[PDB]
Amino acid sequence: MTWSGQLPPRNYKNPIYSCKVFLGGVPWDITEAGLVNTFRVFGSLSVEWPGKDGKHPRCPPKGYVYLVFELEKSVRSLLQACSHDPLSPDGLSEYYFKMSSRRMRCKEVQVIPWVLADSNFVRSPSQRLDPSRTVFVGALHGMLNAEALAAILNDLFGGVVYAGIDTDKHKYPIGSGRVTFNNQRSYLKAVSAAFVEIKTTKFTKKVQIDPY
């Protein structure tokens, strides 16, 4: 099946944070521990980039880095002590900050952290995960947040109780999950549909499903 009926995938509730944050905008930063010594001013912080076991730590990506630290307080602190804009970018939400000091160049960096609204959603918080009544989800959008996951799963059958995407320790998969139901209508219809398409004007995606 296919439609254009999506719910705004850019108007989520931003409750709290639960996984790492993606960062980029530093095409000249020689050492990522510099960014750590400018951000750890607010608390416990750490950093990760591929290749810290290489020939020197001055070999981080051409302009990218990832951050991992205190799951909640430091996360909201950075985002709420720097610059933010809602939907004025005219396409998505974004955060920005600036750690330059006319030492050689000056440019701002752009942040997008992992929110609990990217990990799961419920149609009823007063319910639970039912005994072995859940099917696998994959090949979905590289975010497929709780607004898009709630839109596709209520449109297909309206019989839902819980849905989410699986995470591991700081691997930021956002691409493999499961969905739980309290009705049978969702089990044989999700398996018979196996794939549906989003055909909006400036946003198009698909989500796949497999039996349990």
Q: Are 11 and 203 in contact, with CB atoms under 8 Å apart?
A: no
Strand partners, 177: 137, 165
Are the C-beta atoms of residues 70 and 43 closer than 8 Å to each other?
yes
3-state secondary structure of 65: strand
Largest CA distance in the chain: 63
Positive or negative: CA dihedral 18, 110, 50, 44: negative
Element (DSSP H or E) covering residue 188:
helix 185-193
The alpha carbon torsion through 125, 135, 169, 34 (nearest 10 deg) reads: -80
| Residue with the two structure tokens 């319910």 | 127
What 3-state class would DSSP assign to 40? helix
Domain spanning 116-212: CATH 3.30.70.330 = yes
The 3-state secondary structure of 84-128 reads EECCCCCCCCEEEECCCCCCCCCCCEEEEEEEHHHCEEECCCCCC
Cα separation, 203 vs 201, in Å, equals: 6
The CATH 3.30.70.330 domain(s) of the chain lie at 116-212
